[PDB]
Amino acid sequence: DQPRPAFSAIRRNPPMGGNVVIFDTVITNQEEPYQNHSGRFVCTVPGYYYFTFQVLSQWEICLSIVSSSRGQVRRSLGFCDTTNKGLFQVVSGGMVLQLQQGDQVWVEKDPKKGHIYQGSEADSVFSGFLIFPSAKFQSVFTVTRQTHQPPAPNSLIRFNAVLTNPQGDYDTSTGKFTCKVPGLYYFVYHASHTANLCVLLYRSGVKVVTFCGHTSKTNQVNSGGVLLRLQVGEEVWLAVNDYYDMVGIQGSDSVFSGFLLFPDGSAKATQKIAFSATRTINVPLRRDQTIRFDHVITNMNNNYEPRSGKFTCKVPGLYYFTYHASSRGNLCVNLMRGRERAQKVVTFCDYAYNTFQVTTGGMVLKLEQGENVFLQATDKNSLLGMEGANSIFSGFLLFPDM
Ligand SMILES: CC(=O)N[C@@H]1[C@@H](O)[C@H](O)[C@@H](CO)O[C@H]1O
Numbered sequence: 001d002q003p004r005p006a007f008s009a010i011r012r013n014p015p016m017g018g019n020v021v022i023f024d025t026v027i028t029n030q031e032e033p034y035q036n037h038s039g040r041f042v043c044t045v046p047g048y049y050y051f052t053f054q055v056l057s058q059w060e061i062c063l064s065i066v067s068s069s070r071g072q073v074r075r076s077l078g079f080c081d082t083t084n085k086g087l088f089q090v091v092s093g094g095m096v097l098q099l100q101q102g103d104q105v106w107v108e109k110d111p112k113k114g115h116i117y118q119g120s121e122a123d124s125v126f127s128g129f130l131i132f133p134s135a136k137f138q139s140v141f142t143v144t145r146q147t148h149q150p151p152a153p154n155s156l157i158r159f160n161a162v163l164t165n166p167q168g169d170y171d172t173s174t175g176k177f178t179c180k181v182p183g184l185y186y187f188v189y190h191a192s193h194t195a196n197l198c199v200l201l202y203r204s205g206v207k208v209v210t211f212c213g214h215t216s217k218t219n220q221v222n223s224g225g226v227l228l229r230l231q232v233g234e235e236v237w238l239a240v241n242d243y244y245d246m247v248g249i250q251g252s253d254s255v256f257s258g259f260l261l262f263p264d265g266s267a268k269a270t271q272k273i274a275f276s277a278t279r280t281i282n283v284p285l286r287r288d289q290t291i292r293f294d295h296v297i298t299n300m301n302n303n304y305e306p307r308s309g310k311f312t313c314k315v316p317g318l319y320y321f322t323y324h325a326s327s328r329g330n331l332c333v334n335l336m337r338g339r340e341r342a343q344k345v346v347t348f349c350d351y352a353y354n355t356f357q358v359t360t361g362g363m364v365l366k367l368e369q370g371e372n373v374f375l376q377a378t379d380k381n382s383l384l385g386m387e388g389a390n391s392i393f394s395g396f397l398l399f400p401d402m
């Protein structure tokens with residue numbers, strides 16, 4: 001069969017000490033590459049993988065996805081939240097890594113900024129999955145912005161440094177991705193800032209989504225992302241508006257990744273399953289209400305129902321689900337999986353006092369045919385959905401037939 005390595009793990013009863021962040025409770029671990037006793041993913045199948053975390057702090061936290069090869073540690077970008085006010089904050093980050101057999105990948109905390117919430121109210125997650133195995137028409141990039149000076153107001157955000165870009169599809173001299181291989185792409189970013197920042201994602205000259213985060217002095221991470229089916233020559237890029245700050249503190253970086261999931265014309269079209277939907281309704285949510293994302297950007301194979309907000313599995317398999325929510329107050333959402341009655345997988349909470357925020361969560365889930373996945377509101381219901389402060393829910397099948 002084709003290789004299907006993919007995992008998600010959360011914290012519940014983590015072992016104590018060291019700077020490796022151990023996610024002790026496994027949600028998904030197909031081919032068991034993840035070691036919950038150590039917090040380390042081990043590569044068996046060489047290739048390009050995507051790794052991401054969404055970790056809850058109440059104080060100061062700085063985290064970095066670290067890898068090793070032949071036992072030698074390879075340090076990398078960091079992501080921090082230093083709000084430091086006692087309220088829940090989600091720090092997030094992610095990147096593509098090209099790995100060889102035996103390489104390991106993990107999340108490390110800064111020993112001086114290492115606060116991670118411990119308790120039952122909300123969750124922290126680490127996930128990863130193979131994008132394509134090594135050894136052929138692919139597209140993948142992770143780029144970063146290696147400068148201390150922020151973008152100009154109302155301009156395209158250039159990411160000048162490359163972590164991986166084997167097809168040259170992101171051009172660091174123009175700041176744009178240009179499609180060579182037509183098909184369905186995932187695009188995602190995590191940008192560090194210490195003043196207000198809105199990031200806009202553009203496709204062929206049209207603004208697709210915008211996410212904003214406000215801060216004064218302390219460091220936070222603005223995240224966003226979307227699935228788009230692109231044709232040859234189409235351009236995608238990120239931009240800022242009047243809120244342009246990308247000045248991270250030491251140890252907090254900015255990354256933009258993208259990768260082709262489903263090439264057009266590569267067969268088993270019914271298996272190309274991907275949706276991205278935004279919420280344009282701002283009626284107050286009540287506790288236990290399914291959160292409807294009414295506006296469809298992408299819905300390949302029509303497994304997402306915008307009238308309900310639920311995804312329903314037709315092709316059993318491994319899926320990655322993700323969301324980014326704008327908000328002006330305290331927000332907790334339950335990620336639900338089940339049939340008639342669904343059960344909570346995790347709760348993500350992210351608090352905000354007298355400000356604007358963008359939070360995110362994601363999870364790899366194995367689904368059987370007929371199971372539903374959706375987001376469910378709680379008593380902490382400050383969720384905002386509008387042009388210039390979007391809320392989006394997305395999901396995609398990881399391993400369609402070759
Ligand atoms: C399903 C499974 O294997 N769960 C184990 C659990 O029994 C053990 O307590 C924990 C140690 O932190 O590691 C988890 O992987």
Ligand SMILES: [Ca+2]
Nearest residue numbers: 350351352357
């Ligand atoms: Ca927050």
